Design a protein around this ligand. Structure first.
Ligand SMILES: Nc1nc2c(ncn2[C@H]2C[C@H](O)[C@@H](COP(=O)(O)OP(=O)(O)OP(=O)(O)O)O2)c(=O)[nH]1
Ligand SMILES: [Ca+2]
Length: 579
DNA sequence: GCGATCAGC
DNA sequence: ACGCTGATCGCA
C-alpha cells in the first residue's frame, strides 16, 4: 500500500543531497546492536536496503559520512551510535523528528515515528510496537513487512519536517532544535560510544568486602530484633518495628507502614536497630546497583561502560542516563564515594577532569526574577547554602559543618520551589510556626523571587505553558484544575521548570561550545559524561593545565546573565580524585 | 508491572 | 505538603 524499491544494490539516485533516512535498530540499548534494515526516501523515490549490502557499499558509506548530504531522521543518535559500532560515521543530519516533537511538547512522550506523526494528523505509519511486538514475543518481522514499515517511517519523516519546523518557528524554538539539540545529539553520540573505563578488579574487591560487611550488619539486626526476618520485606520489617518493638508510627504508605530513611532517622532515639537497618540498606544499595549492576553492563574486552543519554525524555529539558545510569553514582557517603575510584581514564597517562556550575539554578533564578538582593549575593560570589546554614543553625561561617550545609541546600531549593511550613518543619525538625516564620523572612530578604513565583504561576494560567531562557516549553494543563492538590503540583512545576530547564539549556550550550573549542585548540581531551550541572572529561596528563583555563571559561561564557556564572573544577587519576 | 525506596543533580 | 530523574526489589 506504499510503493518502494526493495533494492538489491545501491544506486546513484539513492544518494541525493536531501533524504529521509531510517537506520533501524530494534534493540532498546543500541550499543553494538544489529542494524536490521535501511530505508531512504528522497525526490527520486523510496528505497529499502539490506544493511549487509548497503553498509559494505563504499558509495553508500561515503554518502552517510558526507556532511553536505543532508538527512532527516527520527532519533539520529541511535542510528549514529549503532553505525559507530559498525565503524561507520554518520554526518549531515539536518532534521531529527524525535527532538522536534520533544521540543514542541515533551509530555507527548513521543518515542516512535507514529507518535510524532500523530501530532500532525499523519497516520500512514504504524507504531513500532505493533510491528515488532512486546516482550518475549518481540521479533523482527519478515522482510516485506519490515521493508514497508521502514519506508513508511521514512516517508513520514520526509512529509513531517516542514510542518514541524513551522510550528517550531512559531514557538521560537527552531534555533533551539537546529543550533542546540541537534548539535548536542552528535556530541552525546560521541560520549556514549567512547564510554567510561571501569577498574573491574577494584569493583570486584569492593563487592567482596561489601558482602561480608552486609553479613555482619545483618546478624546485628537479627540480634537487635531478637529474631530473623526478610529485612527487605516491608510487611516483616514493619511488623518488627511497629508491632514487635512497638515503635511509633510516624507515616503510612498506600500499602502499610512507611520505613523510608527519613522515618527511620526520626526513630533513632527509640531503638538502635533503625540505624542498622539504614546502614544495611545503604550497603545493599551499593552492592546491587553499583557493584553488581555495573559489572553486569561492563563490556569485558575493553572494561568500558556505555551509557545512553536520553535526550528526549525529561519534562524540563535535562538529560537522563540509562543502563547504566552514570548520573547517580554515589558520592555522598564515604563508603559510597569509593565506587568512583573504579571510574578511570581510558588510556595510560590520561586523567579525569570534572567541572561544575556552582548554584546555577539559583543564579538563573536571580537573573530571571531580577531580585536585587539575590543578584547582589551572587555578584559577591556568596555561597548561599553556607549563608543559609549560618542563619538556620545560628552559627558563624567556620562553624558551618558539611551536614549543616547539605541541610541548608535543601532549604534553599525547597523554599523557592514552594515547600510548605509543614515540609520545612519536618525537614529541620522545628516547630511548624518557626518554619513558617523562616519562610516569611526568606521572602522578605528576596521579595523579587516571591513576586516572580506569583507572576510565573499567573503567566502559566494565561498562556497554558511556561518556557525556559532558550524557549523550551512545558504545557501545564493542570494549572487550572479544580482539584486543589492537582492544581498545586502544577503551580510548583511552573515555579521549577523554567529554572531547572534554563540551567539545562545553559549546560547544553556549554557542551557545544566546549567541543568546538577543544577542536580549535587541537586537544585530545573529550567529554565523557554530563551530570546536569557538571561536565566530566578525560585527557592526556599534558593537557590538564590548558583545560584548567579552557573549560571553566567556556562554561562561564556559555550565556551572559545579570549575575556571573561560577565554575569549580578538579582533576585526578580517577573520577573519585576529580572531586 | 507498580510502588516504595534511595542513588544523584 | 520543594523539583527532575533511573535501578532495585518485594508485592501489604
Ligand atoms: N528542587 C531541588 N533541586 C535540587 C536539590 N538538590 C539539587 N537540586 C538541583 C538543582 C540544581 O539543578 C542542581 C544543584 O545541586 P548541587 O548539588 O550541584 O548543589 P549547588 O550547585 O546548589 O551547590 P554546590 O555545588 O554544593 O556549591 O541540582 C533539591 O533538594 N531540591
Ligand atoms: Ca554544582
Amino acid at each position: 500500500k506504499m510503493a518502494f524499491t526493495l533494492a538489491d544494490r545501491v544506486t546513484e539516485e539513492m544518494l541525493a543531497d536531501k533524504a529521509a533516512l531510517v537506520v533501524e535498530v530494534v534493540e532498546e540499548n543500541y550499543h553494538d546492536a544489529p542494524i536490521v534494515g535501511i530505508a531512504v526516501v528522497n525526490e527520486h523515490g523510496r528505497f529499502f536496503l539490506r544493511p549487509e549490502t548497503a553498509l559494505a557499499d563504499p558509495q553508500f558509506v561515503a554518502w552517510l559520512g558526507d556532511e553536505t548530504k543532508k538527512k532527516s531522521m527520527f532519533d539520529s543518535k541511535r542510528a549514529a551510535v549503532a553505525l559507530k559500532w559498525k565503524g561507520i560515521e554518520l554526518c549531515g543530519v539536518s532534521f531529527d523528528l524525535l527532538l522536534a516533537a520533544y521540543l514542541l511538547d515533551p509530555a507527548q512522550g513521543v518515542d516512535d515515528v507514529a507518535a510524532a506523526a500523530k501530532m500532525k494528523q499523519y497516520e500512514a505509519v504504524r507504531p513500532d510496537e505493533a510491528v515488532y511486538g512486546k516482550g518475549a514475543k518481540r521479533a523482527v518481522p519478515d522482510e516485506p513487512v519490515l521493508a514497508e514499515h521502514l519506508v513508511r517511517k521514512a516517508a513520514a519523516i520526509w512529509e513531517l519536517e516542514r510542518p514541524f519546523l513551522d510550528e517550531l518557528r512559531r514557538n521560537e524554538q527552531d534555533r533551539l532544535l537546529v543550533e542546540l539539540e541537534q548539535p548536542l545529539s552528535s556530541i552525546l553520540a560521541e560520549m556514549e560510544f567512547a564510554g567510561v573505563k571501569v577498574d573491574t578488579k577494584r569493583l570486584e574487591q569492593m563487592g567482596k568486602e561489601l558482602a561480608e560487611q552486609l553479613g555482619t550488619v545483618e546478624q546485628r539486626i537479627y540480634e537487635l530484633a531478637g529474631q530473623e526476618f526478610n529485612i527487605n520485606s516491608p510487611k516483616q520489617l514493619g511488623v518488627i518495628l511497629f508491632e514487635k518493638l512497638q515503635l511509633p508510627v510516624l507515616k503510612k504508605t498506600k500499602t502499610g507502614y512507611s520505613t523510608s530513611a527519613d522515618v527511620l532517622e526520626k526513630l533513632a532515639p527509640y531503638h538502635e536497630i533503625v540505624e542498622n537497618i539504614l546502614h544495611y540498606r545503604q550497603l545493599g544499595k551499593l552492592q546491587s546497583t553499583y557493584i553488581e549492576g555495573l559489572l553486569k553492563v561492563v563490556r569485558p574486552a575493553t572494561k568500558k561502560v556505555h551509557t545512553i543519554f536520553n535526550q528526549a525524555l525529561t519534562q524540563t529539558g535535562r538529560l537522563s542516563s540509562t543502563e547504566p545510569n552514570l548520573q547517580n553514582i554515589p558520592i555522598r557517603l564515604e563508603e559510597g564515594r569509593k565506587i568512583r575510584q573504579a571510574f578511570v581514564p581510558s588510556e595510560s597517562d590520561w586523567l579525569i577532569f570534572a567541572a561544575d556550575y556552582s548554584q546555577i539554578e539559583l543564579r538563573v533564578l536571580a537573573h530571571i526574577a531580577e531580585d536585587d538582593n539575590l543578584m547582589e549575593a551572587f555578584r559577591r560570589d556568596l555561597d548561599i547554602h553556607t549563608k543559609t546554614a549560618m542563619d538556620i543553625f545560628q552559627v558563624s561561617e567556620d562553624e558551618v559543618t558539611p551536614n549543616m550545609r547539605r541541610q541548608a541546600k535543601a532549604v534553599n531549593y525547597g523554599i523557592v520551589y514552594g515547600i510548605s511550613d509543614y515540609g520545612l518543619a519536618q525537614n529541620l525538625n522545628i516547630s511548624r510556626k518557626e518554619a513558617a516564620e523562616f519562610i516569611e523572612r526568606y521572602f522578605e530578604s528576596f521579595p523579587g523571587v516571591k513576586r516572580y513565583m506569583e507572576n510565573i504561576v499567573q503567566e502559566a494560567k494565561q498562556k497554558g505553558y511556561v518556557t525556559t531562557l532558550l524557549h523550551r516549553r512545558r504545557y501545564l494543563p493542570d494549572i487550572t484544575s479544580r482539584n486543589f492538590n492537582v492544581r498545586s503540583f502544577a503551580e510548583r512545576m511552573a515555579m521549577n521548570t523554567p529554572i531547572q530547564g534554563s540551567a539545562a539549556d545553559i549546560i547544553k550550550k556549554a557542551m557545544i561550545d566546549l567541543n568546538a573549542r577543544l577542536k580549535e585548540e587541537r586537544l585530545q581531551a573529550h567529554l565523557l559524561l554530563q551530570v546536569h550541572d557538571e561536565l566530566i572529561l578525560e585527557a592526556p596528563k599534558e593537557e590538564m593545565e590548558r583545560l584548567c583555563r579552557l573549560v571553566p571559561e567556556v562554561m562561564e561564557q556559555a550565556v551572559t546573565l545579570r549575575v556571573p556564572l561560577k565554575v569549580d573544577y578538579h582533576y585526578g587519576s580517577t573520577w573519585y580524585d576529580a572531586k
